[PDB]
Design a protein around this ligand. Structure first.
Ligand SMILES: [Ca+2]
Lengths: 98, 125, 9
């Protein structure tokens, strides 16, 4: 959380899907219906710069895409991810037309 | 990833590295020809690296394929980051095996408290 | 946040 250390080896982290409450209360007026928070409010565990665009897989399903947050692993500042379950139709249509 | 652990080699087969000289973002293989990532990771030139573990050393399981098409969500908002999703079509199909596999799209949204697995080569500090 | 860094320069 303090510095710049980019690994050569793929890193892993298991985190839970946080409720809407914890997500919206962490970023007032900044969370839309296409975002979900996954992480720990106590900070210390989180995705960071470089992990962007990466996968958040839950129960064998891609539920999130590393998107944004305020810094990395700061307390009460969990990462926010694109809510993939709203984009299946878009993904399908796009793949079929290209 | 901060406060994480080193994934077992190739235990995340759907994980890809977007490269343009060097790794800049992650991605997920959901189809033999398509990778999904974030729109804010957009670059006009992108090489997709599959079957990666140690992005600094050829291990012999990698498949380096250039992006043929890059499609960012039309409603992507750079200010709010709403619709931060992007699709990448590979110029040639990725060969699926034990080290390179697709990840399923959600059959439904996840309930709160659902444990998930996050991966990547981003900043660890 | 949880953005890019490497190969973004
Ligand atoms: Ca390698």
């Amino acid at each position: 959380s303090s510095g710049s250390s980019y690994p050569s080896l793929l890193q892993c982290l298991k985190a839970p899907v946080l409720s809407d409450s914890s997500c919206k209360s962490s970023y007032p007026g900044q969370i839309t219906g296409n975002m979900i928070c996954v992480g720990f409010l106590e900070g210390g565990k989180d995705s960071c710069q470089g992990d962007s665009g990466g996968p958040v897989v839950c129960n064998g399903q891609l539920q999130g895409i590393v998107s944004w947050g305020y810094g990395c692993a700061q307390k009460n500042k969990p990462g926010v991810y694109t809510k993939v379950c709203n984009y299946v139709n878009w993904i399908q249509q796009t793949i079929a037309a290209n | 990833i901060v406060g994480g652990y080193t994934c077992a080699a190739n235990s995340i087969p759907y994980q890809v590295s977007l490269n343009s000289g060097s790794h800049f973002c992650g991605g997920s293989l959901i189809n033999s020809q398509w990778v999904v990532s974030a729109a804010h990771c957009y670059k006009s030139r992108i090489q997709v690296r599959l079957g990666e573990h140690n992005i600094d050393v050829l291990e012999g399981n990698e498949q380096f394929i250039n992006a043929a098409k890059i499609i960012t969500h039309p409603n992507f908002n750079g200010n709010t980051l709403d619709n931060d999703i992007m699709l990448i079509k590979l110029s040639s199909p990725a060969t699926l095996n034990s080290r390179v596999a697709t990840v399923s799209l959600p059959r439904s949204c996840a309930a709160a408290g659902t444990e998930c697995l996050i991966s990547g080569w981003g900043n660890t500090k | 946040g949880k953005d890019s860094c490497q190969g973004d320069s």
